[model samples]
Target: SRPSVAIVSPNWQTARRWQEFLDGTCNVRMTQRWPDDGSQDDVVMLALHARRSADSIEAWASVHGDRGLAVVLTGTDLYQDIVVDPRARHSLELAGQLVVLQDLGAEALPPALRGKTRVIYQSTPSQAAASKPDTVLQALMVGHLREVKSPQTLFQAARLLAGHDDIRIDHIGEALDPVLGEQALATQRDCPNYRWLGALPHDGTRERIRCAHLLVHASAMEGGAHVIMEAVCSGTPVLASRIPGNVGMLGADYAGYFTHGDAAALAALLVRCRQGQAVPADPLLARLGAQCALRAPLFAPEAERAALLRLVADLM
Candidate 1:
């Protein structure tokens, strides 16, 4: 019989990622909620979130026993839910093992709970280095407009750079918040150098990232941002916020950090990179590229698949 694994996530995109990756080796039954699938004598549950999938995690323990369940933590789960929510905490406690998308997520847990946590960086196929026009430096930001993501920081930085003719910033994200959507519209009208492109499908966003001169991530928090990893693997350098999640992925000594939500700092980094574009050698942007290249191998599909399979193998 094929190995049956019940994978429950909060949304379709996430649920699909698991089904696609685990398609060949594992029998993955993906669901957004607790489906009334009939009893299986030997099945494991892989829950994508601690809080959002708490009910599924609980059911896994109640029905299949402790060792059959593992929980994958999201940014909110590691950085927020586990801190203040009782239900979320219970999921953590109930999970046989905890999975955090990035290394730094473990720091958010209690000293006792750290023992069972694992770091798994998501993977993407590599793209050839993007070619850029010499006249302009295109910087891209891909994420939804939300508070935790700190979309305002990018808007403000765009406003500051309105006078820089050589640098253009394009943002792609769904305006998840209505007010932020209006703010994006306002920024587009007020800032010539910035354009809010609204939401794009994942493939289009990746195409945009590969072609852009740089990728900016100003999130206030993250478990591990797929944008950063995508940028790294695509040979697009990143300018990110100085937060633990960013630091964990970019490394402790990464050069492209600006203080979180500080528009002036982000603006300064953009200006500095723009200035480097005119130089013949030793450009700061190239330095950032080398740093990203050094980290790219860590996010390869083979590495992630091996780690993911090992985790599930142990649970089974």
Candidate 2:
């Protein structure tokens, strides 16, 4: 029989993502908020984010106790919230098990909570394909325009790459912040090579990832990016910002990285990847691909499901 689960997430989109992943195996119901009373018959509560779902976690714990409640930490919750927020810290204290999306995430936790904290890497089913075009080195950036995502770095890189006609960059995200929204509009105006395509549906974004030569992620923080895994599983490479969450996903030695928020450095990589005539370009990408291949298996759906199931079983 399936383990009964009540998975609380931040929003409907997120609820669907987690529901799709845990569906058949776990008899799961998704909600944005927890009921004041309690879950009907859930054997476990899988709440995403220590801070965002702190109320849900607390409500469930207050009624049912801590035997079957687990909290999953996101980048902000682990790197920022848990540091200063009492609610986030309290969430950790109440959870019977704590989950971090990537390996380095464990290191970000307090030493006392480290014992219960486990790294359960998020997964995307492989959408592998031979879909990239050879003419231009197209790169996709699939994150919303928010401070944490650092869309400005991509905009700055766009300013630097105004001369590179062969390097086409497409950005697919909504303007989540008004200030950043204006910045994105300005980038579209100033840089012909960069196009802010706005928000896209998940399948459309994954299909785009399947066709692109590479994906560029300039996030200042990430728990574990769904886009990175989608790109990797689809035979696309990544050029990421050098941050712990990214480093955890891409591995320490992956060659295609630039300093976080350093637009000049990111621009250099954009120029390099587009330099098809450069004798060194493919070699650099090849090494980067090899490194990504090593990390790819860890994000496999089989592994993720097994780990999630094991964790759920253990929690119950």
Candidate 3:
């Protein structure tokens, strides 16, 4: 029989995806609010952002006991909040299990907390590899236009690659920050090689990822990006910022990483990729594809389902 699990999480895509992963393995109930009325579930999974959920976690623990509570930390919680926020730290201490999305996540925790931590890599359904246009190479960046997504770095890289008409950069995201929106607009206007497609639906974005030759992830931080996994699963290789979150996703020796926030390095890599495309076999792209294929099995839906079942079963 499946464990009866209640998950309290924010209404973000991250939480939604977790629910998808756990749906069949557990008798799952999910909500945005804390269950203040003493609901009896075999276990409780908490995916709310750690710093903000301390009070709710405390109150639930006061009445329900903490043994069945598992707290999942986000990128901000691991990299930013747990360092300075007492509330975030308290949540870490109180939970029965602490979950991190990627391999390096446990390393971010205090030594005392490491024993309870579990690393669960997120997964995406594999897509058939799409055909690429032989004439011009297409590069796509998918993220909301915000400071942390490193829109500036992408914009600068676009500017640097403006001379290569054979290299095209397409950005897909909503302008979460108005200043960044202006920059995107300005970059598109000045750089003939760049186009800001601005936030498409999830399927639309995935289809784009399937079709593109390369996916560029320039985020300054991440817990683990679904996009990176999706791109890998779709047989599209990535050019990522060399942050722990990204390194953990792509593996330490993946051939396609550029220095974090370094537009010149990213632009140079793109130029190399563009040049390689002209040959019978694009060496850089071929190496990235081979490396990504080895990593693809880790992001399979079946692997994620097995991991989620194990986590929930352990909580019970």
- Best TM-score among the predictions, by candidate number: 1
**TM-score of model 1 (CA atoms):** 0.94
Please, what are the lDDT tens digits per residue for candidate 3 over residues 69-179? 888877888878988998888888888888887898788777899999988787777889998887888999999898989989989999988888999999999998989
Please report how far candidate 3 places residue 295 from its true position, in Å. Answer: 0.7
* Best-to-worst lDDT order: 1, 3, 2
For every candidate, C-alpha RMSD to the true structure in Å: 1.9, 2.5, 2.1
Error of 1 at 100 (Å): 0.7
CA deviation > 4 Å runs, candidate 3 = 11-17, 36-38, 278-282
Report lDDT per candidate. Answer: 0.85, 0.83, 0.84
**Candidate 2 local lDDT, residue 185:** 86
Q: Tens digit of lDDT per residue, candidate 1, span 214-265? A: 9999998988898898899999999999998998889998999999989999
Between candidates 1 and 3, the TM-score winner? 1
Cα lDDT tens digits for candidate 2, 1-316? 8777888886114456667667878888877787734466778888887788888889888888888988888787887898889998999999999988888888877788899999988777776566566667788899888899988899988888888888888999998898998988899898888899998987788888888878999998788887888788888889999999998889887899899999999989877777642345546666666777788898787887788878878988
Better of 2 and 3 by lDDT: 3
Residue pairs in candidate 2 whose N, alpha carbon or C atoms collide under 3 angstroms: none
Candidate 1 stretches with Cα past 4 Å from truth are: 11-14, 278-282
Error of 1 at 187 (Å): 1.5
